[PDB]
Amino acid sequence: SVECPFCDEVSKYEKLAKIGQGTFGEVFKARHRKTGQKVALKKVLMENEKEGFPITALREIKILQLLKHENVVNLIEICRTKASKGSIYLVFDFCEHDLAGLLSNVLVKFTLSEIKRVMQMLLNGLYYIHRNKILHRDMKAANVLITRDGVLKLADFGLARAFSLQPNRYTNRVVTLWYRPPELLLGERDYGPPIDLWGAGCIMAEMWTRSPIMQGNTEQHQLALISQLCGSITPEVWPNVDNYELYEKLELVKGQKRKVKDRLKAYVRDPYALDLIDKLLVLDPAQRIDSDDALNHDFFWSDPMPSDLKG
């Protein structure tokens, strides 16, 4: 009826499986009817959307179209479905594994040189998106995919947002709880890329521990668990932390440990690995290692050197 040359109908894909199996939302595996190509379909949720096409959807789509890189998920196109009362699908390239389900699986085994590559790819991905003035804001094992040719992809830019540098007033409930950084828990609203690098640390560790390292239940109960690993939240250790409103929640103003290294030595053998992890899981965001200096850390430049993937 209406001319529509640049938005094909999603029926070009054959649905196959609810790949979230609950846990991603309404997200399907699917097969391009002519080529065989496998893809992921996300329906743009329209429940309680009173203000037309959702702004958060528009934002994600803007971001995905910008971010084009070997280690970021690829948005192929956006698809409609013919009305009479109609919907919109984001169409990603299908990735066969994700790092959560790979760590979960006991038959899967990670050699050191592989683990280096996984991290190398992840930080490269982070370098890119931050270089493009964008915060991911949802780092977690589950959102880190790997292709059958062993190429890692950052995925789920659903709560991603553009950033820059009056203070910045950014949404504070962001990042899953177990991978959420200190700053955000102490109510920080002008933050940037360090929040993702914090996440990369919890993931890095998880690559040996095979399970998320800091499984809290609330803001305070999380921030407790963090304090029981990275020291406690001292202005000595983090210049100006006192200045935060939410300072002295249950935050034991005395009860500190010292090191991450100790509780992880048991699992992480390599001396160089532990060191990277420590400069990533730093309390002060402005003294946390960055994407760039992290990639240059001797972990990625010593033996066994980083290698391609099968396991």
Next chain:
Amino acid sequence: NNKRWYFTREQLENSPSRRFGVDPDKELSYRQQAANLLQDMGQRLNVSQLTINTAIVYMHRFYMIQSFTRFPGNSVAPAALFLAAKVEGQPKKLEHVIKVAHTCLHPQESLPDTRSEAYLQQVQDLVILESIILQTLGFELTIDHPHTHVVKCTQLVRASKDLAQTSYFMATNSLHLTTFSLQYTPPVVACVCIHLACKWSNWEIPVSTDGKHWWEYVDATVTLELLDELTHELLQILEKTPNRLKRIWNWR
């Protein structure tokens, strides 16, 4: 495609609107009109000129696919502005855009009972049209904002506030009054506006110490023969437009 939304004069002539019997004349008029409605509503809605500009670009591209005979400017423009403001992060509530669109288009008429069918419909009608705008554009909404290119390249020719202001003016009006945005890259257009602003201001940019002209430092395709053809064209429609030129005319 990187050149999907760029067209030749040949292509523009065979628009979807010509195809339903609309003179070239009438079409550029309908375009100019939707820009005015957009600028008017944008001002009352207190959105940035950028947001208006984004909305105008959507409108220009929209009508390279759809014909004005099937979607009128008065219908599209609020939907397009509604969207633009969300895309550029100055989102305006849907009610609010409907009210402001109404008073713009029907100043004397009364604001309908915001509980009626007449209203609950013209609310659904907009949301419907926004959806159609998105699909016609194939969800490509990041616009290359033509003001940055002009501000960039006024300072690369060390211009006064006056020559700067005059250029920005030419650029804004080139959006409303021409289909240059649908033919020439934001840098080429910027060069056009700066060039004209100089002619209008009797200013001359000195030929560079290399022997080359100022505009080669922005975009390598820009030739004096082109700039003269375009600044002529822009100036003609500026002369046609009542009181436009008055705003930048030297009265003193």
